């Protein structure tokens, strides 16, 4: 339940991180698979699941672009993310407890790349935003 202030900080922080979004994405996914191995069952059709692999790289940018588009849909995230909630609920059947894991690794990747920028006040808003993207993705499950 993102406020006006939460929205300003995400849009601005989002602007400085924009440029490295592929790098952030690919690294954030590779870390999820590497430190949280229960998530590996969902990507078994891939040739490599090692950090920096080709499929890891490419899917990482995909995830970051979707987050990017969520940025502009901040006023209605369940509406905006409906199709992706179905894909993950029914087609992929991803247990919704994995959304938290993906979000924690994205914050870890941000702290590693923008330490001075990732302040406690930037962390609150990004955390809230990421929790809200998650909730929108887990909305069509039941």
């Amino acid at each position: 339940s993102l406020t006006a202030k939460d929205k300003s900080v995400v849009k601005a922080f989002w602007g400085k991180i924009s440029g490295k979004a592929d790098v952030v994405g690919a690294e954030a996914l590779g870390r999820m698979l590497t430190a949280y191995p229960q998530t590996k069952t969902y990507f078994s059709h891939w040739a490599d699941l090692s950090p920096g692999s080709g499929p890891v790289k490419k899917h990482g940018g995909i995830i970051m672009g979707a987050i990017g588009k969520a940025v502009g849909l901040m006023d209605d995230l369940v509406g905006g993310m409906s199709a992706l909630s179905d894909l993950h609920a029914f087609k992929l059947r991803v247990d919704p407890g994995n959304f938290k894991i993906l979000s924690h690794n994205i914050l870890v990747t941000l702290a590693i790349h923008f330490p001075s920028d990732f302040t406690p006040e930037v962390h609150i808003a990004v955390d809230k935003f990421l929790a809200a993207v998650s909730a929108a993705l887990a909305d069509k499950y039941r």
Binding site: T34, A35, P51, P120
Partner: protein, 146 residues
């Protein structure tokens, strides 16, 4: 659990670059700022009223170093962590009544601080054995909740 010799060395190697006096206060303060309901547990600490208030608080500073010394004993004693932490677990549960989910929130914020501190040398792999150690700790802490 089973710790390999390389695993154990990775941990004490990670813990070795960490300065309790720096990371202690950073992590506990962040925990009180990002998950503000955690503040009601810390009664006497005072003016927590703002992030600036929280960040500049010395009682907070100090409890952050208290928490890090407890973690140091787990690093030293990677074999008896369940034994090491029985009384800590009993106090958080029966004296303090801390909802046990708060242990994982804390573990996650300490990890973000170490990452921002270590930068690129905090690798996926390292993160991975750092993460196995944090779940053992979280296990040990929530061990006398019955």
């Amino acid at each position: 659990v089973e710790w390999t010799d390389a695993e154990k060395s990775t941990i004490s190697a990670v813990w070795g670059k960490v300065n309790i006096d720096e990371i202690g206060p950073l992590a506990l303060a962040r925990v009180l700022i990002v998950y503000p309901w955690t503040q009601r547990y810390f009664g006497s600490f005072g003016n927590v009223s703002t992030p600036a208030a929280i960040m500049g608080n010395p009682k907070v500073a100090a409890h952050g170093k208290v928490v890090c010394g407890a973690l140091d004993k787990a690093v030293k004693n990677m074999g008896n962590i369940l034994a090491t932490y029985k009384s800590l677990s009993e106090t958080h549960a029966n004296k303090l009544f801390v909802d046990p989910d708060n242990f994982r929130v804390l573990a996650d914020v300490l990890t973000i601080v170490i990452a921002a501190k270590f930068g690129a040398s905090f690798t996926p792999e390292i993160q991975a054995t750092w993460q196995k150690f944090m779940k053992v700790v979280v296990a040990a802490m929530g061990s006398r909740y019955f």
